[PDB]
């Protein structure tokens, strides 16, 4: 509730989604390919 | 607040595994996420799996932007301090050759990573417990490791939330890295709580150990994020610790 404790859960939730969320996807499609591949 | 507990946890970063120019050999490269609180010793084997079909000896390191990544900082930190300023994915380099001197040995083995995770857990129990480590059993132990290596995150925290609890910390571990300092990291004792028993602050642990924060305006990074200094130093230590209760705190510059 606290304005610096929402501060962060903001910061962590806006984090994974340009980091995790972002790559999630299309790193196991290409990884699936690669193998597909070979 | 378990749900910081939980967004901490299972935090990645996009990795990007490319061949060094010299290595012999097509290879494409290896596109893998990785859990910010694990260590690069965990998902080195999957990296061993796809260039393994290329090559030579598995005797590998990485490097980014060439200087070499250390197996005993969580991947998390390594990020942060290095990488975080730079687009993503992350990109690193591997090599199977031309192996360093100035680094780590070969990737350790698993128990030696084991050992040394469980060696930071000791120390930092010690500093802020009396103790509870010494209490609980060896068959405990082997559940803080399964839960870090295998990322199941109610198998590790079941036995962790006791090593975060205090009766109503004494200090609060903590391992400040700085880019361009000739030590490695500063650790020193800090207590949570002050003479007149008030709640310590973030801006307080850097004042008294790490002041040099405060032109080259620099950036205090935990997990991937800049917490405004107000945040209660224990509180910290409860949720934003790393698995091996530590809280690895990164000043990095800015753009």
Same mark, same amino acid.
């Given at each position: ?38 | ?15 990007? +595994? ?10 494409? =490269? ?10 690069? *010793? ?42 975080? !300023? ?14 360093? /001197? ?6 350790? !083995? ?12 000791? /120390? ?10 010494? /209490? ?16 199941? +995150? ?11 609890? $205090? ?12 880019? *361009? *300092? ?28 790490? =002041? !040099? ?18 945040? =209660? ?8 610790? $790393? ?11 800015? =753009?």
């Amino acid at each position: 509730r606290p304005r610096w404790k929402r501060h962060i859960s903001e910061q962590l939730r806006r984090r994974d989604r340009l980091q995790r969320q972002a790559f999630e996807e299309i790193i196991l499609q290409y990884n699936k390919l690669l193998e597909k591949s070979d | 607040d378990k749900d910081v507990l939980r967004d901490v946890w299972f935090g990645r970063i996009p990795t990007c +595994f490319t061949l060094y120019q010299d290595e012999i050999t097509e290879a494409e =490269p290896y596109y893998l996420l990785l859990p910010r609180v694990s260590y690069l *010793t965990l998902v080195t084997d999957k990296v061993k799996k796809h260039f393994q079909k290329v090559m030579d000896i598995s005797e590998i390191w990485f490097e980014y932007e060439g200087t070499p990544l250390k197996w005993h900082y969580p991947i998390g930190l390594l990020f942060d301090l290095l990488a975080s !300023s730079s687009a993503l994915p992350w990109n690193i380099t591997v090599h199977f050759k031309s192996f360093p /001197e100035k680094d780590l040995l070969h990737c350790p !083995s698993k128990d030696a990573i084991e050992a040394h995770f469980m060696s930071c857990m000791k /120390e930092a129990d010690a500093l802020k417990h009396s103790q509870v480590i010494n /209490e609980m059993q060896k068959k405990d132990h082997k559940q803080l490791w399964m839960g870090l290596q295998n990322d199941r +995150f109610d198998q590790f925290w079941a036995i962790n939330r006791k090593l975060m609890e $205090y009766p109503a910390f004494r200090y609060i571990p903590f391992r400040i890295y700085q880019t *361009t *300092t000739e030590r490695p990291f500063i650790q020193k004792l800090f207590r949570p709580v002050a003479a007149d028993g008030q709640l310590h602050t973030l801006g307080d642990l850097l004042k008294e150990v790490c =002041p !040099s924060a405060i032109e080259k305006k620099n950036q205090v990074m935990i997990h991937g994020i800049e917490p405004m200094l107000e945040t =209660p130093l224990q509180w910290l230590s409860e949720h934003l610790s $790393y698995p091996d209760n530590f809280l690895h705190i990164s000043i990095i510059p800015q =753009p």
